[PDB]
């Protein structure tokens, strides 16, 4: 049944952990499945973080070649993108929360960590890469999840990326798709330097039978918020920041044209196209709303 995935097999998990097959291979984990509740909690926490960054922990299991995530819990850190982990407050919090959840019925174990990159894409920086490398070196398995709560609102689709790094000294053989991601100027050097040390798993979402029934029952009352959204007002500081970054990139492209990585004008054009398309979508939504509601003069 669909709820079969919700059954936790302690014996099978112990057997898989004790018969680790990921050691012989390196790209062993290729699929990453996320429950509906975990994804929703991650997105709401990243959004409520605001403009700052938030990070939590993820509880799941493994089934052969795929990595399943069932739950996620935040940890305080006072957020504010502190230097790194914690003044030991989060260090106590992780163990305390796991122990408390053990005696209730949350009998799954940690599988990774998630954090937010609000406004500048979904990737692993240098410190993130070092953290994931260290975690995978000792406690295995482990997956990093990066969310973009601002681009999610702006584009209408969730911006979630699951990543896993490579061992020290390992040179992956080509096979780089490298789809384009807009990244500001002040955060481009780190992305360029630390880009071949990790790979992105294919992420899919799942939900239970009761969850599906409840969502299909809830849509009958939730259809209002789609028609009363007005996305052009909630995201204006983000658009202003995007325009500032685009102007700086255009200045750099003009400097390269005057002088004597490659063709920065094309990248600036793609960024401008993305921003303008988002703005026009926001406007046409309001045009549709006006046509629906303001013209039906009794």
């Amino acid at each position: 049944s669909i709820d079969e995935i919700y059954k936790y097999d302690k014996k099978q998990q112990q057997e898989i952990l004790a018969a680790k097959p990921w050691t012989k291979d390196h790209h062993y984990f290729k699929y990453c499945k996320i429950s509906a509740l975990a994804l929703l909690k991650m997105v709401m926490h990243a959004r409520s973080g605001g403009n700052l960054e938030v990070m939590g922990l993820m509880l799941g299991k493994v089934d052969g070649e795929t990595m399943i995530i069932m739950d996620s819990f935040a940890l305080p850190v006072e957020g504010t993108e502190t230097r790194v982990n914690a003044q030991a407050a989060a260090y106590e919090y992780m163990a305390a929360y796991i122990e408390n959840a053990k005696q209730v019925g949350r009998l799954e174990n940690a599988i990774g960590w998630y954090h937010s990159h609000p406004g500048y894409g979904c990737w692993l920086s240098g410190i993130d890469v070092s953290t994931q490398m260290l975690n995978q070196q000792f406690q295995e398995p482990f997956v990093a999840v990066v969310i973009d709560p601002t681009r999610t609102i702006s584009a209408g689709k969730v911006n979630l990326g699951a990543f896993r790094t490579y061992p020290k000294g390992y040179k992956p053989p080509d096979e780089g798709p490298s789809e384009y991601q807009t990244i500001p100027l002040n955060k481009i050097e780190d992305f360029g330097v630390h880009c071949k040390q990790y790979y992105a798993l294919e992420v899919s979402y799942f939900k239970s039978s009761l969850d599906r029934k409840l969502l299909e029952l809830l849509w009958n009352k939730y259809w209002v918020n789609t028609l009363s959204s007005s996305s052009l007002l909630t995201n204006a500081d983000y658009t202003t920041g995007q325009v500032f970054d685009l102007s700086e990139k255009l200045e750099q492209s003009e400097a390269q044209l005057g002088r004597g990585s490659e063709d920065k004008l094309a990248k600036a054009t793609r960024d401008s196209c993305k921003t303008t398309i988002e703005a026009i979508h926001g406007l046409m939504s309001q045009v549709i709303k006006d046509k629906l509601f303001n013209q039906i003069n009794i």
Binding site: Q13, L57, M94, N109, F138, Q139, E140, F142
Partner: peptide, 12 residues
């Protein structure tokens, strides 16, 4: 004396 030691991931 001997004391299983357990990490967050689940390894003992």
């Amino acid at each position: 004396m001997l004391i299983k030691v357990k990490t967050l991931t689940g390894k003992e």
